[PDB]
Amino acid sequence: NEILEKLLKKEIKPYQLDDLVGEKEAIELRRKYIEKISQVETKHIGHYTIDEKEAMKKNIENMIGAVQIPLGFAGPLKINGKYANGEFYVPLATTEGALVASVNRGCSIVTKCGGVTVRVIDDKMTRAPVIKTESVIDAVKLKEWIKENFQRIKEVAESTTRHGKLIDINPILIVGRYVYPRFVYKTGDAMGMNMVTIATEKACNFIEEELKKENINIHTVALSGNACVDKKPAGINLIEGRGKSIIAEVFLKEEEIKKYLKTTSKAIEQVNMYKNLIGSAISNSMGFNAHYANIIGALFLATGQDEAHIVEGSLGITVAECTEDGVYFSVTLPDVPVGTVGGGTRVETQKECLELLGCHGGDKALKFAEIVGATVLAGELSLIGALSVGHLARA
Amino acid sequence: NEILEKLLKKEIKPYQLDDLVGEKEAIELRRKYIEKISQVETKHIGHYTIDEKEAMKKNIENMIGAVQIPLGFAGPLKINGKYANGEFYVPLATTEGALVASVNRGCSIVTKCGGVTVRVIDDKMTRAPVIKTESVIDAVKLKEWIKENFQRIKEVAESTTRHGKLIDINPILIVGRYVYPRFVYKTGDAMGMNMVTIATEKACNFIEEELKKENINIHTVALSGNACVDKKPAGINLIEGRGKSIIAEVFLKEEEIKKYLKTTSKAIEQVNMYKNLIGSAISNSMGFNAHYANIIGALFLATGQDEAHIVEGSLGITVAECTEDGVYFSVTLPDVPVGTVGGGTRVETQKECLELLGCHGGDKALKFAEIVGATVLAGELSLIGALSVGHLARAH
Amino acid sequence: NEILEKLLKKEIKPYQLDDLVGEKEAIELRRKYIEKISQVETKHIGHYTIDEKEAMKKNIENMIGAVQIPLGFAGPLKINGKYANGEFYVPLATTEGALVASVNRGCSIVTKCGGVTVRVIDDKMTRAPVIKTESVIDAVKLKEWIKENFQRIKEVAESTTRHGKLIDINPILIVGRYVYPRFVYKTGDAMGMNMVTIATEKACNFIEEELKKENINIHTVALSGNACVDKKPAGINLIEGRGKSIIAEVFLKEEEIKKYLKTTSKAIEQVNMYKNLIGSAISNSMGFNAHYANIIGALFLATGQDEAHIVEGSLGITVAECTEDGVYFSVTLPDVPVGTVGGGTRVETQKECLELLGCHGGDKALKFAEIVGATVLAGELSLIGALSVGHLARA
Amino acid sequence: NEILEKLLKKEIKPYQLDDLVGEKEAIELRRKYIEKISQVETKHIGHYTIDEKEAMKKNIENMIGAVQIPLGFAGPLKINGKYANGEFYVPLATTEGALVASVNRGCSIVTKCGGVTVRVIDDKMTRAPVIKTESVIDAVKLKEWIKENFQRIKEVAESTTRHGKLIDINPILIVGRYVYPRFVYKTGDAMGMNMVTIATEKACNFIEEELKKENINIHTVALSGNACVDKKPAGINLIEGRGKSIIAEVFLKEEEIKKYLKTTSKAIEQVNMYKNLIGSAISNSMGFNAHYANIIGALFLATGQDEAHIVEGSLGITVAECTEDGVYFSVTLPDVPVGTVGGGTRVETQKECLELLGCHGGDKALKFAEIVGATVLAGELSLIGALSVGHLARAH
Ligand SMILES: [Cl-]
Ligand SMILES: [Cl-]
Ligand code: NA
Ligand code: NA
């Protein structure tokens, strides 16, 4: 209590508290400190089961408790992938009512029609520093030096990690006398944020020194020059991709569309065109889709992905096309940063959710990516199919 | 146990369980079922203190338990707003290490430099159906009729809601023979997703019948025509706004920048230009900022906003400018859908987090928006200031 | 010749030359001055017929001659518009081979199938200053003051012209403490650039003074704050429109598609979807079309529109849809700044081209807009139809 | 005269005339025809000095005469480039009054402050077909085969041209089962439109046949899949570049800014930020500049570039920054398709304008690009400086 009063008088700050007291009671002191300031008592945030010692060290600061997100599932979901095969029951954490049911309805239709074909198109994590040079003349020299000494930069970056591998520096953007080199890494099963920052920092320190020997002065202004692009919607991510780039598709027969979706293939194609394609074009949107962010969001929260990367997962294009025997229906997500180790996957509830998919640990990120894509297709098909019903009726 | 076997044999579906057995036990049964399919045991997801019966009816389906997100706070954060005044301790739920510490550092620097000036610029929620007409001739007629009969459409829309007010139908986009009317509503303290869908649907039925009397056949293809725009990044939202449009500002003197941020106003201006402005411009990004999505995400999860709306909050522009007396630093977030009742705010842990802000219930959505903007500035200032420190050092 | 030597020694500059000598010989002196510097003789740029006295005063500075652009035509083009009715032969000036022939082929198909239905959706010209305020608090006051005193601002702006009319100030954008008010004008038949700058300048001087009386200090940084948006591709123009917003459409029967286009309606829809819709989405394009800029460009050069406004005319969306009896095919151009008086319409060759359309002078801009839209449809249909042939064959 | 009547009766079409009569008289005949349909007489369009026979074969169809665009110049313009060195007088064809005067003012200010530093950053032309495959499985196979067999595709592509070199196929975009390979060519001094279409078509025929041997069926839907991107504004062009990518720079001392621009370096930086950067950001524009399209347009018309490529040249970013010794000012144009042979450069008046620059013919496209960038900077500097003058005055 004397500590609590020193917190109120601000002789001691909440951040330094963990060294004066145990970490378990550190959470209670912080929880009661902010309760007294706000004049409100809490019952729920203080009741959790995750490991507070490890959470403080890797996942959060100034911990006062935990929030609880309702967890449901959608399934069964038959997937025909390179890494995911069989039927999956997918966990989904959300506070939006009807979202899990919409995906679950999509999973059932897809599974009864043979499952989703899905493939990972690309797999990379990127970091794009901004480097200042004295003039455009140096910016050109800097760019051409990078491209011709890539193997040297690759050894320097890779000496910082047992798990990362630098595969490219492309594109290299120049605006005036500023250079934005997009370092491209393989990250194994980690999402790779921390690894690509450390590998790129050493790479940039090395470039700066090597160029200084050639009488060219540069310096990195910031390791993230907003050309990565990280946690913002960007054309560079839509085009070049980031994280996992995933495509999932199904072919449905006309009789399956009538039986399970209660509609027709031309209606589905019309809805997709008027809404997902034309509607996104005229409002200058980067999401030519209906529901990716919602499905990405629910699956990311359950499995401990970075919540801000829902921004990146909202990019993409749904294609629905009439075929002779029914529809072709596909989702394309060029920008899905996921991982099955590190980050939030270590928090206990999220670990269990990955275990229910068989996707926690090493050699599982590509499997998890394929599940992500199949789940998005299932849910995008459910939503687009339900809209085509109302479309048919009203017409 | 007999039922567990009937689930494995697929005699009964998981969705039908809540009525045969208690909803409390429905959750445990379908968790045993997912455990037996994946052949793995769980220990943590089964712990939940939240009310499962109402969560099943309003927030989730096929519930098996709960995910737990670590919850911290950042503060103190002094805010000079129209609705938020005083020092706030902002709760933040995240799994990303160091994020809360970065915002917590920003809150303290700003607080002892006088607090954050914040204003809500706009407050509205939108729904934009796709309407098919026979031809551009009818599409033009439709647009003009909407503009002419707006008051009547307004009364039909408002008859479905006690809090919703239809204030505009603008812009009204036409592509070929397709019409995308952007209905603009006031929603009170709700985020407004469900209110604007019910109000817009009856309005569209009324437009369709009134036009049929003039022998003009239209029909709504979908109540969401992707011109809203909802849960996607779009120029219409960046320009016209959606949800709350928030702006936060601070003026810092050169002596405060040196003492608290360990840098100068020139370096902060330089970082912001090269990274937030030029960097976003050349990569064709709509987020001319460093950290909005990260901060929005942590606050949205803690307070029960919709997770997919982090997409909308990642839009915006950070401005940092050298002034005679220091630096001017501001964030602009034109597209922040928040609510203090309904949706996920009902979930107990998230409700308590709104209570810690004094932002649960009616007449508090604008207070909450001002807190959101002040927190984003605090963290955006922390990050940019930390980058300008490295910037100066490497220059020397 | 003594003047020529003073030009070489730079005692006198080319700009001040018109007061020392006649304007006719001013052009010859400038032409020979730059010839001597470059050590090349010219024969063509010096042979023209346009009025040099008026061109110097309204269209060009430092004139040395004229460039000649080949002029052809496309037709007949039957148009079913509110202002354009009947068959038109459209002049087109270009240096690209096959462009006029592609449009001419489209005009013939369309005319044999009943002509193009076209309508002007909107008609406005805009100017968006950037105004600096001391703080966001003032920026809000500034915005709310503008909206509540619009009638006062409208009288002030309109006192500068007999032809402009201020119809709106919307949207009003605020970034931090900077305010971007989009002034919206009717301009009659002029494109309106010069009128909206003069009307807006007086409007801003008045706002600045009125706000100063209320103890709020603002000042306009620039009358064009890049939110207009003028001569750049922008979502605000795509969504809110600028200049003329035009939509043209045709319905074609299946037998007409086979007979005149040598293809089918599903092929046309497939080409449009894969190329104009999906291809533009994945490359993050604002032109969901094939050929607008080319057709806009050829028609603008012939009739004296501002060449940089081809940027704005490249925006838009082509929709091609299977119907029970054939196709629906439409073009949407939300951003087409044109005029039938002022600007370049006064240069003699361009005046004649507008006369061939019956579109020079007052009360003709909307007629000309409808012709622009019908011409773009004709050419977009020709190009998309020719691609669907190769598509059918290769499949 | 008898033929004139057969045109009015539609017995013969205008296109068939060039073979029955001389092409010189074909032009006069079909002008009489358009005159008689519109019931109006023309006097000016019938004057042309250009070679009509070759223009009819390479530049135009259904020719009736010529349009005349007023031609001026701006100079002197001192350029410090890799390929352009010395003082240039830049010809500019326009109907917009005051534009040439604005650039002419910029050229003189820069010239006596030391000239424009300019560099060509990149030089390539692109064509991106749409290829349909049966499924994403085959689309992945197709992408990997292209990457694996690039050298063979390169030899097939280069067999169609003496100047074209295929240097890359990147990026290779996949949407569903559709594949958009961006072929990247060197084109010498041509703009490359026609060369990259012929080379890419044979390359695609070769890919299609080689995949058929492995029992994988693909087919090119169109040689231009709108991912090129050609004559539209697109992020892929802003990011990866197309045509010439040009950057021009000047450093100006505070004393030169005061004396020649009548302003200060702070005001220039402020205008550029509020207008070119923030203004373009909030309106979702891809042109973070004031005047590129205007200057590009006048130069493109004078020198015979494609008018529709003004769309591509309007992209880019202007940077103005306070330096210890004055201001740094630069323009970046990542997407400028130019050529010095072929296309419209052949037209006589435009050829003479290239000659006035010493840029007609082979080994001069890079010189011409450097001149383009220096002219855009000169005019962009003139405009922004003129806006900063008004800025300072109204502030006082
Ligand atoms: Cl060099
Ligand atoms: Cl106030
Ligand atoms: Na409740
Ligand atoms: Na020739």
CSV table of C-alpha atoms in Angstrom, one decimal, chain A residues 113-352:
chain,number,residue,atom,x,y,z
A,113,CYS,CA,-18.6,-30.0,-53.3
A,114,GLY,CA,-15.1,-31.4,-53.0
A,115,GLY,CA,-13.1,-28.9,-51.0
A,116,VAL,CA,-11.0,-25.8,-51.8
A,117,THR,CA,-8.0,-25.9,-54.0
A,118,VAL,CA,-5.4,-23.5,-52.5
A,119,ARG,CA,-1.8,-22.6,-53.2
A,120,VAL,CA,0.8,-20.3,-51.7
A,121,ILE,CA,2.0,-18.1,-54.6
A,122,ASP,CA,4.8,-16.4,-52.8
A,123,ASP,CA,6.3,-16.2,-49.3
A,124,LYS,CA,8.5,-13.3,-48.1
A,125,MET,CA,8.8,-10.6,-45.5
A,126,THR,CA,10.2,-7.2,-46.4
A,127,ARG,CA,11.8,-4.1,-44.9
A,128,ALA,CA,12.4,-0.9,-46.9
A,129,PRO,CA,14.7,1.6,-45.2
A,130,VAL,CA,14.9,5.2,-46.4
A,131,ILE,CA,18.5,6.3,-47.1
A,132,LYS,CA,19.5,9.9,-47.6
A,133,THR,CA,22.3,10.7,-50.1
A,134,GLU,CA,23.8,14.0,-50.9
A,135,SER,CA,22.5,14.1,-54.5
A,136,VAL,CA,20.7,12.1,-57.2
A,137,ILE,CA,24.2,11.3,-58.6
A,138,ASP,CA,25.0,9.4,-55.4
A,139,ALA,CA,21.5,7.9,-55.2
A,140,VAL,CA,22.2,6.3,-58.6
A,141,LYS,CA,25.7,5.1,-57.4
A,142,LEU,CA,24.1,3.8,-54.2
A,143,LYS,CA,21.4,1.8,-56.1
A,144,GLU,CA,23.9,0.3,-58.6
A,145,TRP,CA,26.3,-0.5,-55.8
A,146,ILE,CA,23.6,-2.4,-53.9
A,147,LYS,CA,22.7,-4.5,-57.0
A,148,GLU,CA,26.2,-5.4,-57.9
A,149,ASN,CA,27.3,-6.3,-54.3
A,150,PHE,CA,24.2,-8.3,-53.3
A,151,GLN,CA,26.0,-11.4,-52.3
A,152,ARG,CA,28.2,-9.4,-50.0
A,153,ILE,CA,25.0,-7.8,-48.4
A,154,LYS,CA,23.4,-11.2,-48.2
A,155,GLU,CA,26.2,-12.7,-46.1
A,156,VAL,CA,26.2,-9.6,-43.8
A,157,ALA,CA,22.4,-9.8,-43.3
A,158,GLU,CA,22.4,-13.5,-42.7
A,159,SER,CA,25.1,-13.5,-40.1
A,160,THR,CA,22.5,-12.1,-37.7
A,161,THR,CA,20.2,-15.1,-37.7
A,162,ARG,CA,20.0,-18.8,-38.0
A,163,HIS,CA,16.5,-18.6,-39.6
A,164,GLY,CA,16.4,-15.6,-42.1
A,165,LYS,CA,17.7,-15.6,-45.6
A,166,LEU,CA,18.0,-12.5,-47.9
A,167,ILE,CA,16.7,-13.4,-51.3
A,168,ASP,CA,16.4,-10.0,-53.0
A,169,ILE,CA,16.6,-6.2,-52.8
A,170,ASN,CA,13.9,-5.2,-55.2
A,171,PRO,CA,12.5,-2.8,-56.2
A,172,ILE,CA,15.0,0.0,-55.3
A,173,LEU,CA,13.0,3.3,-55.4
A,174,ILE,CA,14.6,6.7,-55.7
A,175,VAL,CA,12.8,9.9,-55.0
A,176,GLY,CA,15.2,12.8,-55.5
A,177,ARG,CA,18.2,12.1,-53.4
A,178,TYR,CA,16.4,9.5,-51.2
A,179,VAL,CA,16.7,5.7,-51.8
A,180,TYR,CA,14.1,3.1,-50.6
A,181,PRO,CA,15.6,-0.4,-51.0
A,182,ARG,CA,13.1,-3.2,-50.5
A,183,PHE,CA,15.0,-6.0,-48.7
A,184,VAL,CA,13.2,-9.3,-49.3
A,185,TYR,CA,13.7,-12.2,-46.8
A,186,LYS,CA,12.7,-15.7,-46.3
A,187,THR,CA,11.7,-16.1,-42.7
A,188,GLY,CA,10.9,-19.8,-42.3
A,189,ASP,CA,7.8,-20.1,-40.1
A,190,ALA,CA,8.1,-16.8,-38.2
A,191,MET,CA,6.3,-13.8,-39.5
A,192,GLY,CA,9.8,-12.3,-39.4
A,193,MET,CA,9.3,-8.7,-38.2
A,194,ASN,CA,12.1,-8.8,-35.6
A,195,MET,CA,14.5,-10.9,-37.8
A,196,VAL,CA,14.2,-8.6,-40.8
A,197,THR,CA,14.8,-5.5,-38.8
A,198,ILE,CA,18.0,-6.9,-37.3
A,199,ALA,CA,19.3,-8.4,-40.5
A,200,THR,CA,18.5,-5.1,-42.4
A,201,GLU,CA,20.1,-2.9,-39.8
A,202,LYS,CA,23.4,-4.7,-40.1
A,203,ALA,CA,23.1,-4.7,-43.9
A,204,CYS,CA,22.6,-0.9,-43.9
A,205,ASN,CA,25.5,-0.3,-41.5
A,206,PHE,CA,27.7,-2.3,-44.0
A,207,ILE,CA,26.4,-0.5,-47.1
A,208,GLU,CA,27.1,2.9,-45.4
A,209,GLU,CA,30.7,1.9,-44.5
A,210,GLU,CA,31.5,0.3,-47.9
A,211,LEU,CA,30.2,3.4,-49.8
A,212,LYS,CA,32.1,5.7,-47.5
A,213,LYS,CA,35.3,3.9,-48.6
A,214,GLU,CA,34.4,4.9,-52.2
A,215,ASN,CA,34.0,8.6,-51.2
A,216,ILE,CA,30.2,8.5,-51.1
A,217,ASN,CA,28.5,9.6,-47.9
A,218,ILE,CA,25.0,8.1,-47.2
A,219,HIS,CA,23.1,7.4,-44.0
A,220,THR,CA,20.0,5.5,-43.2
A,221,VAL,CA,17.3,7.8,-41.9
A,222,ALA,CA,15.0,5.0,-40.7
A,223,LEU,CA,14.9,1.2,-41.2
A,224,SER,CA,11.2,1.5,-42.0
A,225,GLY,CA,10.9,4.1,-44.8
A,226,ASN,CA,7.2,3.3,-45.3
A,227,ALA,CA,8.0,1.4,-48.5
A,228,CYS,CA,7.9,-2.0,-46.8
A,229,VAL,CA,4.9,-1.6,-46.6
A,230,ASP,CA,3.9,-2.6,-43.0
A,231,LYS,CA,0.5,-2.3,-41.5
A,232,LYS,CA,-0.8,0.2,-44.1
A,233,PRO,CA,-2.7,-0.5,-47.4
A,234,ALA,CA,-0.4,-0.1,-50.3
A,235,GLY,CA,-0.2,-0.8,-54.0
A,236,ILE,CA,3.4,-2.1,-53.6
A,237,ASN,CA,2.0,-4.9,-51.3
A,238,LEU,CA,-0.9,-5.5,-53.7
A,239,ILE,CA,1.4,-5.9,-56.7
A,240,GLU,CA,4.7,-7.3,-55.3
A,241,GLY,CA,3.1,-9.1,-52.4
A,242,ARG,CA,4.2,-9.4,-48.8
A,243,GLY,CA,4.0,-12.1,-46.2
A,244,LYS,CA,2.1,-15.1,-47.8
A,245,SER,CA,0.5,-14.6,-51.1
A,246,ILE,CA,-2.4,-17.1,-51.3
A,247,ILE,CA,-5.0,-18.1,-54.0
A,248,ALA,CA,-7.9,-20.4,-53.3
A,249,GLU,CA,-10.5,-21.6,-55.8
A,250,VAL,CA,-13.5,-23.9,-56.3
A,251,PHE,CA,-15.4,-25.1,-59.2
A,252,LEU,CA,-19.1,-25.6,-58.5
A,253,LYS,CA,-21.7,-27.3,-60.7
A,254,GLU,CA,-24.9,-25.5,-61.5
A,255,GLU,CA,-26.9,-28.2,-59.6
A,256,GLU,CA,-24.7,-27.7,-56.5
A,257,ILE,CA,-25.2,-23.9,-56.6
A,258,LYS,CA,-29.0,-24.4,-56.7
A,259,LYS,CA,-29.0,-27.1,-54.0
A,260,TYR,CA,-26.6,-25.6,-51.5
A,261,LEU,CA,-26.5,-21.9,-52.3
A,262,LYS,CA,-30.1,-21.6,-53.5
A,263,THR,CA,-29.1,-19.4,-56.4
A,264,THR,CA,-27.5,-19.5,-59.9
A,265,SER,CA,-24.0,-19.0,-61.3
A,266,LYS,CA,-25.0,-15.9,-63.3
A,267,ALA,CA,-26.4,-14.2,-60.2
A,268,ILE,CA,-23.1,-14.9,-58.2
A,269,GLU,CA,-21.1,-13.5,-61.1
A,270,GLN,CA,-23.4,-10.5,-61.4
A,271,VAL,CA,-23.1,-9.7,-57.6
A,272,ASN,CA,-19.4,-10.1,-57.7
A,273,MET,CA,-19.1,-7.8,-60.7
A,274,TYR,CA,-21.4,-5.0,-59.5
A,275,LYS,CA,-20.1,-5.1,-55.9
A,276,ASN,CA,-16.6,-6.5,-55.7
A,277,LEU,CA,-15.3,-5.3,-59.0
A,278,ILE,CA,-17.2,-2.2,-60.2
A,279,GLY,CA,-18.2,-0.9,-56.7
A,280,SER,CA,-14.5,-1.0,-55.5
A,281,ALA,CA,-13.3,0.6,-58.7
A,282,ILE,CA,-15.6,3.7,-58.5
A,283,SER,CA,-15.0,4.2,-54.8
A,284,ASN,CA,-11.2,3.9,-55.5
A,285,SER,CA,-10.8,0.9,-53.1
A,286,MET,CA,-7.9,-1.5,-52.9
A,287,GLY,CA,-10.1,-4.3,-51.6
A,288,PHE,CA,-11.9,-5.9,-54.6
A,289,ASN,CA,-13.6,-8.2,-52.2
A,290,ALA,CA,-16.5,-8.4,-49.7
A,291,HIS,CA,-15.3,-10.1,-46.6
A,292,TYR,CA,-11.5,-10.7,-46.4
A,293,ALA,CA,-10.8,-8.4,-43.4
A,294,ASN,CA,-13.6,-9.9,-41.3
A,295,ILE,CA,-12.4,-13.5,-41.9
A,296,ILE,CA,-8.7,-12.6,-41.7
A,297,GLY,CA,-9.5,-10.7,-38.5
A,298,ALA,CA,-11.3,-13.6,-36.8
A,299,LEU,CA,-8.6,-16.1,-37.7
A,300,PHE,CA,-5.7,-13.8,-36.8
A,301,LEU,CA,-7.1,-13.1,-33.3
A,302,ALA,CA,-7.6,-16.8,-32.5
A,303,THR,CA,-4.0,-17.8,-33.6
A,304,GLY,CA,-2.1,-14.8,-32.2
A,305,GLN,CA,-1.1,-13.0,-35.4
A,306,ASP,CA,-0.4,-9.3,-35.4
A,307,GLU,CA,-3.7,-7.6,-35.3
A,308,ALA,CA,-2.6,-4.6,-37.4
A,309,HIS,CA,-1.7,-7.0,-40.2
A,310,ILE,CA,-5.5,-7.3,-40.8
A,311,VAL,CA,-4.8,-4.1,-42.8
A,312,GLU,CA,-2.7,-6.1,-45.2
A,313,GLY,CA,-5.1,-9.0,-45.4
A,314,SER,CA,-7.9,-6.8,-46.5
A,315,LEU,CA,-6.3,-6.4,-49.9
A,316,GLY,CA,-7.3,-8.7,-52.7
A,317,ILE,CA,-9.6,-9.7,-55.5
A,318,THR,CA,-12.5,-12.1,-55.7
A,319,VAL,CA,-13.2,-13.5,-59.2
A,320,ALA,CA,-16.5,-15.2,-60.0
A,321,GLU,CA,-17.0,-16.5,-63.5
A,322,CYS,CA,-19.6,-18.5,-65.3
A,323,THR,CA,-18.4,-21.8,-66.6
A,324,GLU,CA,-20.1,-24.2,-68.9
A,325,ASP,CA,-20.9,-26.5,-66.0
A,326,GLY,CA,-21.3,-23.9,-63.2
A,327,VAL,CA,-19.0,-21.3,-61.6
A,328,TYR,CA,-15.4,-20.6,-61.1
A,329,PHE,CA,-15.0,-18.8,-57.7
A,330,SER,CA,-11.6,-17.7,-56.4
A,331,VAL,CA,-10.0,-15.4,-53.8
A,332,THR,CA,-6.6,-13.8,-54.2
A,333,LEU,CA,-4.8,-12.4,-51.1
A,334,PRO,CA,-1.4,-11.1,-52.1
A,335,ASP,CA,-0.5,-9.7,-48.7
A,336,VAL,CA,-1.0,-12.0,-45.7
A,337,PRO,CA,1.7,-11.8,-43.0
A,338,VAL,CA,1.4,-14.9,-40.7
A,339,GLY,CA,3.6,-17.0,-38.5
A,340,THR,CA,3.4,-20.2,-36.5
A,341,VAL,CA,6.2,-19.4,-34.1
A,342,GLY,CA,7.1,-16.2,-32.2
A,343,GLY,CA,5.0,-13.1,-31.8
A,344,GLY,CA,1.6,-13.8,-30.4
A,345,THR,CA,1.5,-17.5,-31.3
A,346,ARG,CA,3.2,-18.1,-27.9
A,347,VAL,CA,0.3,-16.8,-25.8
A,348,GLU,CA,-1.3,-19.9,-24.4
A,349,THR,CA,-4.9,-19.6,-25.8
A,350,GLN,CA,-3.5,-18.7,-29.2
A,351,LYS,CA,-1.1,-21.7,-29.1
A,352,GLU,CA,-4.0,-24.1,-28.5
